[model samples]
Target chain A: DLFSTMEQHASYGVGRQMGEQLAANSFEGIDIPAVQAGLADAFAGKESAVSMEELQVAFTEISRR
Target chain B: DLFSTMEQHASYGVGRQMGEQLAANSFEGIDIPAVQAGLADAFAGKESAVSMEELQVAFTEISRR
Candidate 1:
């Protein structure tokens, strides 16, 4: 075909779930930079990767405004 | 890991590039339901999977109206 339905679904679910959680829990904007930063944050004296708990914490952040 | 770093980036890039393209070309609308429907549509009359090309076409169909 022409599109990645699965990826499209991924985009939609995250946008919707995170968008909905935004009002109830706004942490950070759900964007590429945010996600990369969240990952790159694993620096000296810190974990090497984002944990599940922390992931949810950061995921709440997403929106244009 | 808490959340998939790769996944987050995927969400962001698609949201961005796709979001930007949305201005020039609008299709349906990025949403989980929409994606599911798109996937389900791969029935007897259609293919079983959405290709990369189609993915971009669908990606543009995002953003809150």
Candidate 2:
């Protein structure tokens, strides 16, 4: 179900990151807008709200892009 | 190109989560909005739209936070 949604959107830039953080932090009861906004900032070069480790990982991943 | 977009944004809480899931599942060409919404629900304590296995993994990851 989720995969199909991703396929249709054809854009995993922000969503993909969100999923990674969710999985890593095991964060339940998430705030979609906040998360989304956070993702936008992250993708746009802003600092991540997640831990420093997560931020470092994100930087590495982004560099590969 | 994509990395620059993310970098300008700076906040990657949601984006990182999405990235992890995509890499782990090898998912490509995804829907941004739906995935974002699903992530929101998952973070907001709503049952994940993903499979039981995926959900379990997410929960475990979140719990560490």
Candidate 3:
């Protein structure tokens, strides 16, 4: 889901490329659960529930889970 | 360190911008340990130790820790 999310933004710019590369590279060796956890770590909340302003706070507070 | 690691790449380009935005947004709400774990999820092995080719596989296997 995360990789696809990154891929979804592929045409956006360099971040997409970085995400693509990063995802490609990381996906190769890491276990799925960790990958899933990493994916969740970015925000750890409902996307619809949080504003962009709230997103970063969410990231900083990821340990809440 | 992960956020700093990202800030290091700030001048790179779109990926950098994306990373910066993502980091900024995430850093706000999430807790640190999960953030740390998420950072590690990219690859559990040593960056100096693993080849780029090796990095992806490593990402897919992150549960090892």
- Model 3 chain B weakest 10-residue run by lDDT: B6-15
Whole-model alpha-carbon lDDT for candidate 2: 0.48
**Which stretch of 10 consecutive residues in model 1 chain B shows the poorest summed lDDT?**
B36-45
Residue runs of model 2 more than 4 Å from their true location after superposition: A1-31, A40-65, B1-27, B50-65
Stretches of candidate 3 exceeding 4 Å from the true structure: A1-65, B1-19, B45-65
- Candidates 1 onward: DockQ, in order: 0.08, 0.15, 0.05
Tens digit of per-residue lDDT, candidate 1, span B1-65: 47655456434333333334333443443343443233224311244244545555544444433
TM-score of 1: 0.23
Best by TM-score: 2
- Supply candidate 3's per-residue lDDT for B56: 52
True contacts kept of each: 0.08, 0.24, 0.01
Docking class of 3: incorrect
| lDDT tens digits by residue: candidate 3, B2-39 | 34322222212222233344555432222333333334
Between prediction 1 and prediction 2, the one with superior DockQ is: 2
